[PDB]
Amino acid sequence: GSMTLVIKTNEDLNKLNDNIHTLTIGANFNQPIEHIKWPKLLTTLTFEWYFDQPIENVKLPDSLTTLTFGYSFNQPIEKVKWPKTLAFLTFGYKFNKPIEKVKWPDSLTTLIFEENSLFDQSIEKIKWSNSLTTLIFGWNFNQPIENVEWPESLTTLVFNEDSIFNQPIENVKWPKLLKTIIFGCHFNHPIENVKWPGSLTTLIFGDDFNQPFENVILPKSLTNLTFGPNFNQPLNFLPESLKNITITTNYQQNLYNLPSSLNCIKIISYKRTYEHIVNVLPEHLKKKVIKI
Amino acid sequence: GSMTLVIKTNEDLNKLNDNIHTLTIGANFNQPIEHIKWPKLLTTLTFEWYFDQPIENVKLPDSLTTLTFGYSFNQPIEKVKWPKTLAFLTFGYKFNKPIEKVKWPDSLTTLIFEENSLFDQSIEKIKWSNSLTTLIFGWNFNQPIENVEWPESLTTLVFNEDSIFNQPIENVKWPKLLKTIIFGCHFNHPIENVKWPGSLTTLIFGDDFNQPFENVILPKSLTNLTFGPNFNQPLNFLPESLKNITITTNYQQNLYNLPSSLNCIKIISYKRTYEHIVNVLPEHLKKKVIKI
């Protein structure tokens, strides 16, 4: 007897019962759900492309460990009674609604936004789940984080490589267990007055990031450090416990004061810049340049 | 009244008559055509992929202005009686036969080889039609041209950007009205003693081209000059007529001597190399560097 179900038609609603632990909705159209009786032992629920219906007054089974929202979903969620055992939550492309007053279940460990998520709302007043370990943002998120109470359970914080996030972070208070921080394309802010968590092992910067490292100090635990095409600042005071570094061919600074023991140095070959040609040009012709 | 036909089968030959001005031999048709009576006012003829049959003993109508050969066509043509009004001839990929005794009709203006044409035969003894204006070579053509009798009607000479053509050209007799010369990837020979035509407006060089321009004089008619990635020679005596120039980011020379009256200086960015960061790296760490 079957325990998985994909309700494509309106006919398939007669097919759901309490033996269904895996459910999929919204394959072909925005199926309304306000008056559906959910299976008592539902473990996974996936909302497909077309689904967009309010949920603030829908009681999902507390059995639900995994919930995925689809392309079209965009509704307020600050009023929702989340399942008690929800651990994994994924949000779709079109969802952009305030969550600053949401009541997370303390069982949530992973929160992921879609790669190109429209999500751009303030989060400085949020109460994170005490079990949150992984938080992944999308393309369009750009809000300050200097006054966010990160839970001590947080180990991984990731922005999409094409994130437009660019805010000051010098007054951020990181948790003591945060292992991985990954910034995106647009982040370029001073980091001299940042106290990184002593448990930090992986730190990744993006394209636009180019800041000085003369008054910076990194944790003794740092082992993986990557840089972007625009980073052209000297590296003298890197921690001697560093293991892997990554830089680009746009880097034109001396590397005599780098730590030993580095088991990998990755250089990323990028398309070269133009200054070395424009500088050796006649002044009256520098305005006549086309950069391809 | 249909005046257009595509022949795919032996049966379709019965659809031939004198009303057909546009004829196409189907992709799968590979049959002898020595005994075909061709439409009297045939204007355009196209052979598709699989056609490979002798044509020396075929008399195509004199009204045929546009003629095209397909992928598989590879047959001797030096004995062919070409139409009195042929203007546009195209050869396919697999065509590779001598053309030095061809007897072109004086109406031929345009001769094109397919992009990857295997055509590689000497042409120094050829008699060009007095109306040839545009001649385009393919990939594999590499034969001397210094002793070629070019017709004074030739305006455009092009090698494919991937051409393996690499021969001396310092003794070539360029026609007076030649206006566009484009060289391919592999051309790399001195041009110090080349007498460029006084009507030349466009000259393009390819990737491998790296020859000095100290003792070079270009016409006061030249407007467009292009160089490739390997070009790293100083440019101190370009004509004051030049309007557009193209270079790459691999150009490590000063350009203070560029002409005024330039309207556009195109700089193409290429993938940078790694040595400029390795030669400034701690000696004991250079071993473990990984290049991507």
Author numbering:
A (entry chain EEE), B (entry chain AAA): -1 to 290
What does the literature reporting this entry say, word for word?
The Cafeteria roenbergensis virus (Crov), Dictyostelium, and other species encode a large family of leucine-rich repeat (LRR) proteins with FGxxFN motifs. The FGxxFN repeat proteins belong to a larger family termed FNIP proteins (Pfam PF05725), which in turn appear related to the large and well-studied Leucine-rich repeat (LRR) family of proteins. The structures reveal a so far unique hydrophobic packing with a buried phenylalanine spine and thus define a new sub-class of LRR proteins. We now report the first structures, namely those of Crov588 and Crov537. Their perhaps most striking structural feature is a fully buried double phenylalanine spine that originates from their diagnostic FGxxFN motifs.
Crov539 and Crov527 represent the second sub-class of the here analyzed repeat proteins with an LxxLxFGxxFNQPIExVxW/LPxx consensus (supplementary sequence file). We crystallized Crov539 and solved its structure by molecular replacement using a homology model based upon the Crov588 structure. Crov539 has a short and curved core comprising 12 regularly shaped repeats. This core is flanked by a compact 15-residue N-terminal capping module. At the C-terminus, a unique domain swapping arrangement occurs where the last repeat(s) (261–290) of the first molecule extends across and caps another molecule to form a dimer. Dimerization is also evident in gelfiltration experiments. For both the Crov527 and Crov539 repeats, the packing within the hydrophobic core is altered through a substitution of the LP motif for WP at positions 19–20. The restriction between prolines 13 and 20 and the inclusion of a bulky tryptophan residue gives rise to a reversal of the hydrophobic core packing at residues 17 and 18. Unlike Crov588, Crov539 lacks the histidine ladder derived from position 3 of the repeat as this residue is almost exclusively threonine. Residue 5 on the concave surface of the repeat is uncharged and either threonine at the N-terminus of the structure or isoleucine (Ile110, Ile134, Ile156, Ile180, Ile202) towards the C-terminal region, creating a hydrophobic patch at the center of the lower concave surface.
